[PDB]
Curated annotation (Swiss-Prot), chains A, B, C, D, E, F, G, H, I, J, K, L, M, N, O, P, Q, R, S, T:
Ubiquitously expressed. In particular, expression is high in pancreas, placenta, lung, genital tract and spleen. Consists of an N-terminal domain (NTD) and two tandem RNA recognition motifs, RRM1 and RRM2, followed by a C-terminal glycine-rich region. It comes from Homo sapiens (Human). The chain holds residues 247 to 257 of 414 of the full protein. Homodimer. Homooligomer (via its N-terminal domain). Interacts with BRDT. Binds specifically to pyrimidine-rich motifs of TAR DNA and to single stranded TG repeated sequences. Binds to RNA, specifically to UG repeated sequences with a minimum of six contiguous repeats. Interacts with ATXN2; the interaction is RNA-dependent. Interacts with MATR3. Interacts with UBQLN2. Interacts with HNRNPA2B1. Interacts with ZNF106. Interacts with CNOT7/CAF1. Interacts with CRY2. This is TAR DNA-binding protein 43. The gene is TARDBP. Hyperphosphorylated in hippocampus, neocortex, and spinal cord from individuals affected with ALS and FTLDU. Phosphorylated upon cellular stress. Ubiquitinated in hippocampus, neocortex, and spinal cord from individuals affected with ALS and FTLDU. It is linked to Amyotrophic lateral sclerosis 10: A neurodegenerative disorder affecting upper motor neurons in the brain and lower motor neurons in the brain stem and spinal cord, resulting in fatal paralysis. Sensory abnormalities are absent. The pathologic hallmarks of the disease include pallor of the corticospinal tract due to loss of motor neurons, presence of ubiquitin-positive inclusions within surviving motor neurons, and deposition of pathologic aggregates. The etiology of amyotrophic lateral sclerosis is likely to be multifactorial, involving both genetic and environmental factors.
Length: 11, 11, 11, 11, 11, 11, 11, 11, 11, 11, 11, 11, 11, 11, 11, 11, 11, 11, 11, 11
């Protein structure tokens, strides 16, 4: 069981 | 069980 | 069980 | 069990 | 069990 | 059990 | 059990 | 059990 | 059990 | 059990 | 050519 | 050519 | 060519 | 060519 | 060519 | 060629 | 060629 | 060629 | 060629 | 060639 969470804030 | 969390703030 | 957490702040 | 935490602040 | 923590501040 | 902690401040 | 701690301040 | 601590200040 | 501590200040 | 401590100040 | 692979790739 | 693959690819 | 691989690659 | 590999690669 | 490998590589 | 390897490589 | 290896390499 | 090895190498 | 080895090498 | 070895080498 693997979890992948990205967050990208690029102005 | 592996967890991958990225965060990228690039102006 | 391995955990990978990156954080990148690049202006 | 291994833990990898990077932090990169590059202006 | 091994722990790897980097921190890089490069202006 | 081994621990690796780097810190790099390069202007 | 071994511990490795570097610190590098290079202007 | 061995401990390795470096410190480098190079202007 | 052995301990290794370096310090280097080089302008 | 042995201890190794260097100090180097080189301008 | 240029090649990236991974389970999680964050560009 | 240019190639990315992954289970999660975030551009 | 240029090649990166990894379980987590963060560019 | 240029090659990086790793379980976690942070560029 | 140029080659880096590691369990954690931080460029 | 140029080669670095390690369990933790911090450039 | 140029070769560095280590359990922890800090450039 | 030039070769460094170690358990902890600090350049 | 030039060769350094050690358990802790501090350049 | 030039060769240094040691348990702790401080250049």
């Amino acid at each position: 069981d693997l979890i992948i969470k990205g967050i990208s804030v690029h102005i």
